[PDB]
Each structure stands twice: as structure tokens, then as C-alpha cells.
């Protein structure tokens, strides 16, 4: 109903019955409010915004042309709140529509009388001036004149009660706050006005304090003294005034409500902690105990403001003592005897002990040379208390986790410039740091930058403290890794996908963490990561127990930890791998080759080696071709040995050895490319379905054809490029020019980028390289559908009607029927093809034993039998039950029939027998292998059945032709033939 909602809105302002259409207009406002507030429709947002911020009809002229009516007062109020939510909805992209809002605000304030409309409009004006702290339309705002206009209301101040005047005083603050160059000639006068106002409205000892105008003048002085430094050196009178005002605002009165006015005081101080301090150091015990009691009540924002003000108070006091050595001994001794206070007691709440441990660990610079006795006592009690409060007393799973980042940063802040901690609490320390690591994924976003800051802080604190203690950081990161590998395989549950940002903010985010703590850190952390991953590789005893038949690992906890390790090292290793990974490719790669030799069928170590030699090709490690030539000649022999043990693999193991082999460097490849061309062939034959196999194949081909020398790569292009052909070939088809000429006078990556990459590689490969794609590999599988299966046509079926009865030849249908019954991918077409082939084999058996008189005999079906028996054996072992139902007893009946021969090699029997024996020796299937085992048992049972004993004693003719073939199969060099 949009745009007609605003049309009906623009109709219903000239009503005959006053406030008769006001309620219906309010419902129109709620209708558009429900449409736009909880909205996600991206297109209509600009048009609805243009109508709301127009001149013709909408909310701005609906609120401008309703001032001359009290009946449309609350109309102004409701679209004021709705337009606050609407301008809060979109950010800096409601830019050119604010001068209308501006003059709207000053008119709805100036020409009105009720408080309820002038609260949120003035709120909105302050809010939009906060919304644009960086814009250009504040010049289109007549800013220096509006301060004079809202000071004219101060000149005619006839007592507008509390909250309108609150928003007045916040706008009087924030015109000075943002766009600040237009009020500085009245600075001391507004300073005087707000100070004498809070003084008269605060110290009036005839009446009680009116607290909302107190909060208004408090926020007004806050936003007035933003960017308005007037120190104790320049003018301390205003300084001591605002100090005693902010430290009388936080008096603890019982039966005190409206928990916002002392938070305005503590936001004032948390913004102005470093502004006025000299009189702030005379009420030391008073400020300390008042705020120690005042962060302790049950509200929220006053606790946040009072806590942040307390800590920055402590920061500035610590700075003004850490100017020198022994002249602020007063402040030092009181802060020591006051932070004796909370560390011994039981009102922890994890906040007042949190600030006490933080400050009293920070107080070590001014302490180190003046005491040097309680300094080592600091950092004994701290993690002792950590042991007692949350290590054995398990309370995790509730709200007690959310403090250990600041806890670690406080103990690191006492730990940096310290002496040693000899033997006891240090594995306890490394223990609790990895506990803070491990209790990570229960968090909210955007606090990890403080958690990892705590980790790099404690690592800087531990690394500076001896070569002996640098061992301990290795135990930290190693226990962290063995903790994080304990997770499930893909309040909730984690996996290895979660700490990747922690490890990235460690190993790629140091230059923001050492230029404030007063490059040579992730060097050590990288060596620690490689040492940890290596010492974890050396542990896990990954021999899979036998139940790849049904192999399951003996420690299945080991295997999931291993694959979590390798899948993590995938994403985490190659980033910032420039000069830290490269001096250790020999040792790491050597150990991984050494373990992969003993563990071939794991499919995890090849992915590791792929990532390592990928980073070596990133850092051009094989360009000097020491420990470098050992790496080169190691990888040569390892690749040449892994390419000969991968005829056996068939799962993702096969793909992982392929992704390793094609990720070799070209100077390994160019000295024997004949040994890896089977890898590129298998990767292209597998790369049809499995698309990243083709992806790494295409990356490999653009490596080889660029960097390998031209005259050595050449004689292998005529079997790499021919198998690149099925990628181009994948209703009937489209229309072309000879049809349109006559026709216009009558009427992971996808496959679809692999095709474009293949065409781009054919284009950039040359023209003198390119043409080998047509070069035929063998032609025995090219012309297998084009040889005619016969010379003379058999199976002369005669179609009977009544009087015609023509002759048809079923030999034309046999290749199409057999290819349509084995490879169908359609239910009805498959079942019709299977039924037709069953009848056709019955026809072939019937016609072969019919006795003609005109020639001399029935036609020999042997050449058709030799090409229809492998189909008929592959169809009796199909995964579909119905095809296997009607084609398995057919197979057995055929073995019963064709075993009646009495000449030595009847060609029909030998066709069947050799079809079974190419069934057994097939090195892919298992079903066909043991089904032809069944068939051979049937063959001997029915060769020995369909004969007498003495003629089988005189001359056995199917058994001997069987054994003569089994013998030549047993002496074959092909391994699957000897298995068959």
C-alpha cells in the first residue's frame, strides 16, 4: 500500500470534522511504520526515503503543515519517534536530507507549547549532529546562528519544566562539541552559565535536588567541555569547580532512584579524567571508597562508566607518580596500603579484585628500586588465587569466564620488567594461559583482539626472561595444539575452524602489538608451530586396525586429531611464509616423506607435502638448481616412487597423491616428464566429475607449458591434450545459420569454468602445440561403435501382420540396445531396453539352431556373441535388483546350453568362456569378479554334467580348454591376471 499511504496522508489534513481523520492518519503512520521499521526490501528503501524526505507529500511536510492545529500534536510526536528510528536505520547515506529536518526541528520547537513533542525532536537534532561527525551539510546548517537562537530561549526562559530543557542543554553542549569553530567567542560565558546553573540547581538548601535537570546540565557540561581543555595551569578555578561538582554528584544517598544522573557524572569524569586532577588527588580515600561502593549496585551503565572512570583515574595517578622517583611517596604508600585491602578478602565479584590486581600489578615502576622486596611477592599470590578459584572448582558453563583476558593482561603487566620465577608456579602459569586459550569459542565477536593481545603480552613477558624460559613458550603452544585437536569430525561444540583467527592474529598481527609495548616474535612463533606440528606427527601411531577392507584406526582419537591438524595447517601455514618457513623445508619435508614411506594409505601426508612444496615454489627454493640439493634430490626420488604406488589407490587417496604430484616444481618435472604424464592423464580422466582434480591439472599444465623448455616438452603433447577433450563435448542441440536462413521466411569451481579455462589454455598453448587434441590415442575405442559387428546380417525377424509380413534385421539394434541397457540413467528406458535385450538373446539362440535347407546351415552368431556376452555378464551383476533378477538365471542357462560342444574349441563356447575370463581379470569391479567366479564354477559343473564319464575320460574338451586358459592367465605379468 506504499505511496498511497502517503497519498491518503496528504488527503487527510483538510478534514471537515477536526481530529476525525487524525486517528486514521495515525493508523496510516503505524502502517508505514510496520512496513519500514522491520524491513529488508532493498529496492523500495530509496523511494520511501525520497517520499519521507521530499517537498511534495510525506512526513516532513506532514509535520510542517500541522503546526496550526492542536489536533495533530501527537501526529508530530509519533512521526518524530518513527523518523528517529528511520534515520537510525540507515547510516551515512541519508546525507542530503537534513536541512529539512533541521528547520523542521526549530519550527516544531519554536511554534509549540507541549513538552512531549519537543523532547524527541531536539533529541533527533543532537542525534543527527552525532550521526554526521564527518559530513559537509553542517555548513548548510546555520550552526553559529542556532547557538544564538537557543541562547535567545535562555533570554526568554519562562520555565519549560524538565526534559525539554534537558534536550536544550545537551544541544547547547553538542553544538560546541561537533563543528566546533563557531562558538569560541562565548566560551567562558557558557562555562559560567552552566556552572552557576548547576551550582544554584544543586546547592539550594531550601528544596530537594531536581535530578533530571541535574542530568541535563551534567550531560550539557560534558558535551560542552568536549575538546575544550582548560587546565589547572591555565585556569584552575573552573577546574576545582567542576571537580567538586563531579565529586559531590556521587554521594551515596539511601533511597536514591533514577540511576542515570550519577552516571552522567561518571561519564563526565570518564571523558575528563586527564582534564582536572590536582584537587582530585586530595580526596584519594574518599574517591576510592565512594567508587568502590558505587560500582557495586545493581544497575548497568553507571557501573560501566564508574569502572572506566576509576581505571583511567588510576592511570593518570600512576603517570603523575611515574614522572619521578621518590617525591610522590605519599601516593605510592597509600596505594600500596589500599591494595593490601581487596586482595585478601572474599567480595571478589571478579571486578573489584579485577581492578585491584590490575592496578597493584601496574604499580611496579615506581616500586622497583624503592622497595624491591614485595616485588617478587607480587606474582606469587596472583596465580595461586587463580588455581584456587577456577581450576579445580569447575564453574565453567555459567557466567564466570568473561574476565581472563584482562586477568592475563594484568599479570603480564606485572610480569614484563620483572625477575625470574624459579621452579614452582611456571608450569601452572603455562597451564592457565592455555586454559584461557581453550575456553575461547563461547564468546561474542570482537573481543578476540583483546584475548590474543593478552596472549602476545604474556609471551612477551615470558620471552624476555631467559633462554631457559624460552623453552616454556614451546610447551604453551604445543599443549594448545594438543588441546585443540580433541574435537568432533564434521553452549555448542567447537572444531578446528574457530581458532584460525587467533592463529592469524598471532602470526600476521604483531606490528600493532609491539609499537605500543615499549617481526622477531612470529619468527619464534612460526618455529614453535612447525616444531609442534612435527613433534605431533612423530607421536600419532596411525596404523589402522583391520576389521581398505574395513580399516578403522586403533586409536580413532588419533586419526581425528591428525586430520584436524592437517586441515588446520591447510589454512594456517602459507600466510606470512616468506623467510621463516624456507630454512626448514628440508627437515620438515624429509620427516614427512619418512613417515609417508611407512604410512602410504593415509591420504593426509601428501596434502602436507603439497602445502610445503607449494610454499617452496612460492619462495623459489628450487632456483639454485648444502641443504637445498638434498631437498631437490629427495623430492625427485620421492615423486618417482609415489607415482608407481598409485595404480593401487582409488578414493580421495588417489586424488591426494595426484594433487601432490602435480604440485611438483617444473625442474623436478622437466628431467623425466614421461613419469608424470600418467598423473596428468589420470587427473584429466578423474577431473570430469571431481572438479578440483581438473583444476590442479590445469594449473599444472600452465606451469609446464610455460617453464619447461619447448623442445623437451613436445613429444608428450599427443597424449596429454587428447584426454582434454571430454570437457568440450558435454533436447538435441542449438540452431545455426542454414536453419535460420530458411527459417526466417517461415515463422569449489564449476564445470562451466573448467570449460572456459580449457579453451583459454588451448588458445594460449599455441597453434603449433594445439593440434594434438585431435590426434587419436588408440582408435580401438574410437571406432568401437563404428565397426559393424558383422559382415552378413543375421536375425532376419519377419514382422507378421495379415498379408505383408516384411523382414526386419535386429542386428541394427544391438549396439544401441546393449549400450542403452547398461548405460541408461532412466528407469523406463532401462527396463524397456532390458526386456528387449532378453527377447533378442532368445531370438539369437533360437535362430542359431533353426535348420534351413537352402544354404547348408544356420548362420554363425559368434561375432555377435563375442560382443554381447560382456554386456550380458555386466547386466547380471548390476546394482539394480530387477535387471539382476532377469539376467542372472539367463546367464546360468546360457552356461548350461553352450557347454554341449564336443569339438575342441567351438567358437561359441570359447566366446562365452573368454567373456567370463575377461570378467574375472577386470581390475575395477568386485561384483563382476566374484560373479564370474560363480560363472566358472557353473562352467565346470555343467561341462562335467553334460557328458558321459568315459568320453570325458577319453577326451575332455571344455575342461582342457578351461585349464589351458587358466595356465596362461597364471603365468601373466599383469598382476590382476594372476589374481584372476
Amino acid at each position: 500500500g506504499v505511496r498511497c499511504s502517503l497519498l491518503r496522508l496528504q488527503e487527510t489534513l483538510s478534514a471537515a470534522d477536526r481530529c476525525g481523520a487524525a486517528l486514521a492518519g495515525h493508523q496510516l503512520i503505524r502502517g508505514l511504520g510496520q512496513e519500514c521499521v522491520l524491513s529488508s526490501s532493498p529496492a523500495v528503501l530509496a523511494l520511501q526515503t525520497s517520499l519521507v524526505f521530499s517537498r511534495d507529500f510525506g512526513l516532513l511536510v506532514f509535520v510542517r503543515k500541522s503546526l496550526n492545529s492542536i489536533e495533530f500534536r501527537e501526529c508530530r510526536e509519533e512521526i518524530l519517534k518513527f523518523l528517529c528510528i528511520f534515520l537510525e536505520k540507515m547510516g551515512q547515506k541519508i546525507a542530503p536530507y537534513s536541512v529539512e529536518i533541521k528547520n523542521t526541528c526549530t519550527s516544531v520547537y519554536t511554534k509549540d507549547r507541549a513538552a512531549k513533542c519537543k523532547i524527541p525532536a531536539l533529541d533527533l537534532l543532537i542525534k543527527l549532529l552525532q550521526t554526521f561527525r564527518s559530513s559537509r551539510l553542517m555548513d548548510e546548517f546555520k550552526i553559529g546562528e542556532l547557538f544564538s537562537k537557543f541562547y535567545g530561549e535562555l533570554a526568554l526562559k519562562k520555565k519549560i519544566p524538565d526534559t525539554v530543557l534537558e534536550k536544550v542543554y545537551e544541544l547547547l553542549g553538542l553544538l560546541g562539541e561537533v563543528h566546533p569553530s563557531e562558538m569560541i567567542n562565548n566560551a567562558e560565558n557558557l562555562f559560567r552559565a552552566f556552572l552557576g546553573e548547576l551550582k544554584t540547581q544543586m546547592t539550594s538548601a531550601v528544596r530537594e535536588p531536581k535530578l533530571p535537570v541535574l542530568a541535563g546540565c551534567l550531560k550539557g557540561l560534558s558535551s560542552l567541555l568536549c575538546n575544550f581543555t582548560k587546565s589547572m595551569e591555565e585556569d584552575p578555578q573552573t577546574s576545582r569547580e567542576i571537580f567538586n561538582f563531579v565529586l559531590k554528584a556521587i554521594r551515596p544517598q539511601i533511597d536514591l532512584k533514577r540511576y542515570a544522573v550519577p552516571s552522567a557524572g561518571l561519564r563526565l569524569f570518564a571523558l575528563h579524567a586527564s582534564q582536572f586532577s590536582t584537587c582530585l588527588l586530595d580526596n584519594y580515600v574518599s574517591l576510592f571508597e565512594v567508587l568502590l561502593k558505587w560500582c557495586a549496585h545493581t544497575n548497568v551503565e553507571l557501573k560501566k562508566a564508574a569502572l572506566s572512570a576509576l581505571e583511567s583515574f588510576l592511570k593518570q595517578v600512576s603517570n603523575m607518580v611515574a614522572k619521578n622517583a621518590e617525591m610522590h611517596k605519599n601516593k605510592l604508600q597509600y596505594f600500596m596500603e589500599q591494595f593490601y585491602g581487596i586482595i585478601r578478602n572474599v567480595d571478589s565479584n571478579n571486578k573489584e579484585l579485577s581492578i585491584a590486581i590490575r592496578g597493584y600489578g601496574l604499580f611496579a615502576g615506581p616500586c622497583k628500586v624503592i622497595n624491591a622486596k614485595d616485588v617478587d611477592f607480587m606474582y606469587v599470590e596472583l596465580i595461586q588465587r587463580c588455581k584456587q578459584m577456577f581450576l579445580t572448582q569447575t564453574d565453567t558453563g555459567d557466567d564466570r569466564v568473561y574476565q581472563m583476558p584482562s586477568f592475563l593482561q594484568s599479570v603480564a603487566s606485572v610480569l614484563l620488567y620483572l625477575d625470574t620465577v624459579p621452579e614452582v608456579y611456571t608450569p601452572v602459569l603455562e597451564h592457565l594461559v592455555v586454559m584461557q586459550i581453550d575456553s575461547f569459542p563461547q564468546y561474542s565477536p570482537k573481543m578476540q583482539l583483546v584475548c590474543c593481545r593478552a596472549i602476545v603480552k604474556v609471551f612477551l613477558a615470558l620471552a624476555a626472561k631467559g633462554p631457559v624460559l624460552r623453552n616454556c613458550i614451546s610447551t604453551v603452544v604445543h599443549q594448545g595444539l594438543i588441546r585443540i585437536c580433541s574435537k568432533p569430525v564434521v553452549w555448542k561444540v567447537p572444531t578446528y575452524k574457530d581458532y584460525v583467527d587467533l592463529f592469524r592474529h598471532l602470526l600476521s598481527s604483531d606490528q600493532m602489538m609491539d609499537s605500543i609495548l615499549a617481526e622477531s616474535l612470529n619468527h619464534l612463533l612460526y618455529d614453535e608451530f612447525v616444531k609442534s606440528v612435527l613433534k605431533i606427527v612423530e607421536k600419532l601411531d596411525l596404523t589402522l586396525e583391520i576389521q581398505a577392507a574395513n580399516l578403522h584406526p586403533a586409536k580413532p582419537k588419533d586419526f581425528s586429531a591428525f586430520i584436524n591438524l592437517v586441515e588446520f595447517c591447510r589454512e594456517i601455514l602459507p600466510e606470512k611464509q616468506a623467510e621463516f618457513f624456507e630454512p626448514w623445508v628440508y627437515s620438515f619435508s624429509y620427516e614427512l616423506i619418512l613417515q609417508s614411506t611407512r604410512l602410504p594409505l593415509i591420504s593426509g601426508f601428501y596434502k602436507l607435502l603439497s602445502i610445503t612444496v607449494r610454499n617452496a615454489k612460492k619462495i623459489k627454493y628450487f632456483e639454485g638448481v648444502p641443504e637445498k640439493y638434498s631437498c631437490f634430490a629427495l623430492f625427485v626420488k620421492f615423486g618417482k616412487e609415489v607415482a608407481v604406488k598409485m595404480k593401487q589407490y582409488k578414493d580421495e587417496l588417489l586424488a591426494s597423491c595426484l594433487t601432490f604430484l602435480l604440485s611438483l616444481p617444473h625442474n623436478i618435472i622437466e628431467l623425466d616428464v614421461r613419469a608424470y604424464v600418467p598423473a596428468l592423464q589420470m587427473a584429466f580422466k578423474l577431473g570430469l566429475s571431481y572438479t578440483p582434480l581438473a583444476e590442479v591439472g590445469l594449473n599444472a599444465l600452465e606451469e609446464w607449458s610455460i617453464y619447461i623448455d619447448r623442445h623437451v616438452m613436445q613429444p608428450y603433447y599427443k597424449d596429454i591434450l587428447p584426454c582434454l577433450d571430454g570437457y568440450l563435448k558435454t533436447t538435441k542441440n542449438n540452431w545455426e545459420v542454414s536453419a535460420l536462413s530458411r527459417a526466417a521466411q517461415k515463422g569449489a569451481i564449476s564445470l562451466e569454468e573448467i570449460r572456459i579455462r580449457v579453451v583459454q589454455m588451448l588458445g594460449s598453448l599455441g597453434g603449433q602445440i594445439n593440434k594434438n587434441l585431435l590426434t587419436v590415442t588408440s582408435s580401438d575405442e574410437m571406432m568401437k561403435s563404428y565397426v559393424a559387428w558383422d559382415r552378413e546380417k543375421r536375425l532376419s525377424f519377419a514382422v507378421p501382420f495379415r498379408e505383408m509380413k516384411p523382414v526386419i534385421f535386429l542386428d541394427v539394434f544391438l549396439p544401441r540396445v546393449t549400450e542403452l541397457a547398461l548405460t541408461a540413467s532412466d528407469r523406463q528406458t532401462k527396463v524397456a531396453a532390458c526386456e528387449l535385450l532378453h527377447s533378442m538373446v532368445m531370438f539369437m539362440l533360437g535362430k542359431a539352431t533353426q535348420m534351413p535347407e537352402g544354404g547348408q546351415g544356420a548362420p554363425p552368431m559368434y561375432q555377435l556373441y563375442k560382443r554381447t556376452f560382456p554386456v550380458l555378464l555386466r547386466l547380471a551383476c548390476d546394482v539394480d535388483q530387477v535387471t539382476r533378477q532377469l539376467y542372472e538365471p539367463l546367464v546360468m542357462q546360457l552356461i548350461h546350453w553352450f557347454t554341449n560342444n564336443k569339438k575342441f574349441e567351438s567358437q561359441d563356447t570359447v566366446a562365452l568362456l573368454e567373456a567370463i575370463l575377461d570378467g574375472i581379470v577386470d581390475p575395477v569391479d568386485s561384483t563382476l569378479r566374484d560373479f564370474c567366479g560363480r560363472c566358472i564354477r557353473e562352467f565346470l559343473k555343467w561341462s562335467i554334467k553334460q557328458i558321459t564319464p568315459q568320453q570325458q575320460e577319453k577326451s575332455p574338451v571344455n575342461t582342457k580348454s578351461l585349464f589351458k586358459r587358466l595356465y596362461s592367465l597364471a603365468l601373466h605379468p599383469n598382476a590382476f591376471k594372476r589374481l584372476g
Partner: protein, 242 residues
């Protein structure tokens, strides 16, 4: 694509693309002439769309030809190099820092000069396509790029000499003669080029006279020896030894 400033094909294609009889018949088969026209009108995004449709149409009407028709799918496959060089040129010219430096242009020239068509297997229409498109691209880059001119004008001359070489190598002596006497004006300006020009003219008159008679042969191979010494011979041929 080599100048002449005619607005005829553009207008023919323009008011052909308004109907459907013609706008349908163009972007199924041609589309590459469309790419090279919309590049020449600097409507570069439409050239990118049409060259992507061209790459699609190649696979479209390549998979339709049968396995046995070896010559026809060979004739399709001979188009894919010029079909992708335009794509490479569009990808080059879209990037921004390639138009401030020299090393990406020198990289592109090196890839183009190692990737020539097959001499004695690619016929001269393919060669004409490749070299004319590359010369058009170098003219366009020299326009839109502000050393440079010498490194492209050595490239264009070496490309035309390689085409003359691969046209002499396959008994196409008339086109080789025409392209050789087309370059005679600008091959003069640097005697390094003049040596290669008279040398390829000598090879063309030798290989051209393996067949013509024996009375004509001695007369028309004799033309090279008085044409041969016209330069300062002991300057450049004493400097270079090759």
C-alpha cells in the same frame, strides 16, 4: 582494422541489430568481428560480452561436429588462438597499472612472440587473422598509453617478417611478395631492418625459383645480386656477424 576510416560496417551491423532476423544471425557464428568492431568503437564492455559469447559458441558448434569429420573440427580448432588473444587483450587493457609501467607490456609482447601459429600447418587466413589483430592491438595500446613506441614498432615488424617467412615456407609466394613490398617504405629507417628485408627477399626469390623453368630461373634469381649490395655493406654486416 588497419585504418581507412569508413563508417559502413558499423552502420550495417547497427541497423541490422535492430530487427531479429539479423541480430539473431550475427551472435551465433560471427561475434568476433562484433568484438573487434565494438573494440574499435571503444564500447569495451560489449566487446567483452561478445567475446565471452564467442568462446561459448566455439564449444557449442565444436561439440556438434562428429568425431569422424576430422578436417572440420580442425578448422574450428584453428580459430581458438585468435579467439582468445582478444580476451587476453581485453583483460590486459582493463587493468590499470599495466598502463603506467613497461614490464607488463613487455611480458605481453614476449608471450605473443613466443606464440606464433604453426608454420606449414596453419593456412594463411589463420596467420592473417593473428597478425592483423595483434597489429591492431599494438596500434590501440600505443594510442591509449603515454621506450614504448620502439618496442612495439620492433614487435610489429618482427611479426610481419615472421608471417612473410611462414608464407614463403608454404608456396604462397604471391602473398609473401605482397607483404614484402608492403614493408619496403618503413624498413628503410634502420639498416638493421633493411638487412632482414633484403635477406627475406633473397630467400623468397630463391625458393620461388625452385620451379620456374630453367631459362627464366637464371634471369630472375639474378635480380638479387645487384639489389643485394645497396647498403653500407661493411658497416652493419661487419658489426653483426649473424
Amino acid at each position: 582494422l588497419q585504418g581507412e576510416a569508413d563508417q559502413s560496417l558499423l552502420t550495417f551491423i547497427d541497423k541490422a541489430m535492430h530487427g531479429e532476423l539479423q541480430k539473431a544471425i550475427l551472435e551465433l557464428h560471427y561475434s568476433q568481428e562484433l568484438s573487434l568492431l565494438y573494440l574499435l568503437q571503444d564500447d569495451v564492455d560489449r566487446a567483452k560480452y561478445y567475446i565471452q559469447n564467442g568462446i561459448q559458441s566455439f564449444m557449442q558448434n565444436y561439440s556438434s561436429i562428429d568425431v569422424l569429420l576430422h578436417q572440420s573440427r580442425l578448422t574450428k580448432l584453428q580459430s581458438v588462438q585468435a579467439l582468445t588473444e582478444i580476451q587476453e587483450f581485453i583483460s590486459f587493457i582493463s587493468k590499470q597499472g599495466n598502463l603506467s609501467s613497461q614490464v607488463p607490456l613487455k611480458r605481453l609482447l614476449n608471450t605473443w612472440t613466443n606464440r606464433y601459429p604453426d608454420a606449414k600447418m596453419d593456412p594463411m587466413n589463420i596467420w592473417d587473422d593473428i597478425i592483423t589483430n595483434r597489429c591492431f592491438f599494438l596500434s590501440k595500446i600505443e594510442e591509449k598509453l603515454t621506450d614504448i613506441s620502439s618496442l612495439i614498432r620492433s614487435c610489429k615488424f618482427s611479426m610481419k617478417m615472421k608471417m612473410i617467412d611462414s608464407a614463403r615456407k608454404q608456396n604462397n609466394f604471391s602473398l609473401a611478395m605482397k607483404l614484402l613490398k608492403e614493408l619496403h617504405k618503413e624498413s628503410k629507417t634502420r639498416d638493421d631492418w633493411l638487412v632482414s628485408w633484403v635477406q627475406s627477399y633473397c630467400r623468397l626469390s630463391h625458393c620461388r625459383s625452385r620451379s620456374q623453368g630453367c631459362s627464366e630461373q637464371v634471369l630472375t634469381v639474378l635480380k638479387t645480386v645487384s639489389l643485394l649490395d645497396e647498403n653500407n655493406v661493411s658497416s652493419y654486416l661487419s658489426k653483426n656477424i649473424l
